[PDB]
């Protein structure tokens, strides 16, 4: 029952990029309910303090697998190539990451209104995310799984890489909500 020592996440970015400067946050907005509805992150003002993760990987490859169809339908309809690369790192946790639905729940308790904050399962309720404050350094970033899909020949290829710079210590994801 203890927090996850391991989580990870689904991004576009490789591993030149990654491994050596690690992820930071869109900008500085720590506001929870928006970061986790989307509104802070790419699509909507793409100034999130939190970078997201997972201590699923299943839900990493559901998202790179729909990250993936997507484009193939993208061919399919004739408004696109087919070709798809997603990666999945693996992400040491540390007391930097805060687990989702508890902060979620810290946060509508305190600020909320009505909405998804009475009726809210642990299925139903940003389960296993995990929310890294600012930065996952690249001393955390352990390892990645690169997906490639020809769109062309829809030949899909899996490969894993190393982190040089990953450093081994003991540490797990923060036990509190997080707090502003
Ligand atoms: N990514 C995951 O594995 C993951 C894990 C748990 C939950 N989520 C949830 O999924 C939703 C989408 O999350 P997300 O993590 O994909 O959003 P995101 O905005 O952090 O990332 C989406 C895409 O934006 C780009 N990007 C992200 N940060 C960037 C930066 N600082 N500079 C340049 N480009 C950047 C990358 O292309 C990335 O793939 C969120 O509501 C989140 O809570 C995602």
């Given at each position: 029952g203890d927090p996850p020592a391991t989580v990870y996440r689904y991004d576009s970015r490789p591993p030149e990029d990654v491994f050596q400067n690690g992820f930071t946050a869109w900008?500085?907005?720590?506001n929870v309910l928006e970061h986790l509805t989307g509104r802070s992150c790419q699509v909507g003002?793409?100034?999130?303090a939190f970078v997201s993760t997972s201590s699923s990987r299943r839900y990493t490859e559901v998202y790179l697998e729909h990250r993936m169809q997507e484009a193939v339908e993208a061919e399919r309809a004739?408004?696109?190539?087919?070709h798809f690369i997603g990666y999945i790192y693996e992400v040491r946790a540390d007391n930097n990451f805060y687990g989702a639905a508890s902060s979620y729940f810290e946060y509508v308790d305190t600020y909320?209104?009505?909405?998804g904050r009475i009726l809210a399962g642990a299925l139903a309720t940003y389960q296993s995310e995990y929310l890294a404050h600012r930065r996952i350094p690249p001393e955390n970033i352990r390892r990645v799984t690169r997906v490639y899909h020809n769109?062309?020949?829809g030949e899909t290829t899996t490969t894993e890489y190393s982190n040089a710079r990953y450093v081994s210590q003991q540490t797990r994801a923060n036990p509190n909500p997080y707090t502003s």
């Open positions: 900008g500085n907005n720590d003002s793409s100034n999130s004739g408004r696109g190539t087919g909320g209104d009505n909405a769109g062309i020949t």
